[PDB]
Design a protein around this ligand. Structure first.
Ligand SMILES: [Cl-]
Ligand SMILES: [Cl-]
Ligand code: NA
Ligand code: NA
Ligand SMILES: [Zn+2]
Length: 272
């Protein structure tokens, strides 16, 4: 019986762990792990953390700042160019994801770090990772908002951002399964809101059209429309069955209302 990491201190926050994460044994044995909020170095003792805070020069994530809108910034970090950082980030994320798979061999991934910026620097709020090439068309590998930031719109921002990447690449995608319970709700909310706003405005459109407009897969569009009861089935084909008033009725609900923070595509500066 060797103790696991059960508590971290990061920035001004203390956060209890939700799941096993494979930090080295000597690190799990300690009462609390201490993480630099910028370089994500993990440390055993308050004294080595205090020393690091006074020495570390990083005040943002590494990689490229590919989105900036007011005090929200997203940083793109290649797992091959910044392997230790990405390894730390994965260890941190495994404390709050049950089924996240890889931690150490991060070269196949790009990581998108969501930050909230103030005078002291750019503070990590959440992330998603993404396979550089995905056979099964997963535009998200793992995705996480850190607990003290959850249920405030940051998770839907991440989801939206991942689809804006997909729209840029002219592809559709879907997050890797399994999702967390919070993950399923956040995706169902985002999918529903995106589709309802399109159907509210819009010439008529097919399932394949909505897929082309949103980068949401047809299967994810279909299952969203079924849960909203806005699709008919006619001899093996799903057909959109939109009553223009029930669309409005759905948009006044809390589960499918607009997310408070939205990705302004103009502020996204990206390319292959
Ligand atoms: Cl907590
Ligand atoms: Cl959210
Ligand atoms: Na933070
Ligand atoms: Na989007
Ligand atoms: Zn540091």
């Amino acid at each position: 019986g060797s103790k696991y990491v059960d508590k971290i201190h990061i920035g001004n926050y203390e956060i209890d762990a939700w799941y096993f994460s494979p930090f080295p044994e000597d690190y799990g044995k300690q009462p609390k792990l201490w993480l630099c909020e910028y370089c994500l170095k993990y440390m055993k003792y308050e004294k080595s953390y205090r020393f690091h805070l006074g020495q570390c020069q990083w005040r943002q994530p590494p990689g490229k700042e590919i989105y900036r809108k007011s005090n929200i910034s997203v940083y793109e970090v290649d797992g091959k160019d910044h392997k230790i950082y990405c390894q730390n980030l994965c260890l941190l994320a495994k404390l709050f994801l049950d089924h996240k798979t890889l931690y150490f061999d991060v070269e196949p991934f790009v990581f998108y770090i969501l930050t909230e910026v103030d005078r002291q620097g750019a503070h990590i709020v959440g992330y998603f990772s993404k396979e550089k090439e995905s056979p099964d068309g997963n535009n998200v590998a793992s995705i996480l908002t850190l607990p003290p930031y959850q249920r405030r719109g940051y998770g839907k921002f991440l989801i939206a951002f991942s689809y804006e990447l997909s729209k840029l690449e002219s592809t559709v995608g879907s997050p890797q399964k399994p999702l967390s319970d919070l993950g399923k709700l956040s995706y169902r909310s985002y999918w529903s809101w995106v589709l309802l706003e399109i159907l509210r405005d819009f010439g008529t459109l097919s399932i394949k059209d909505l897929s082309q407009m949103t980068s949401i897969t047809q299967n994810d569009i279909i299952s969203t429309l079924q849960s909203l009861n806005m699709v008919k089935y006619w001899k093996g084909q799903h057909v959109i069955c939109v009553t223009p008033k029930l669309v409005e009725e759905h948009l006044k609900s809390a589960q499918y209302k607009k997310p408070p923070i939205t990705v302004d595509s103009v502020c996204l500066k990206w390319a292959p």
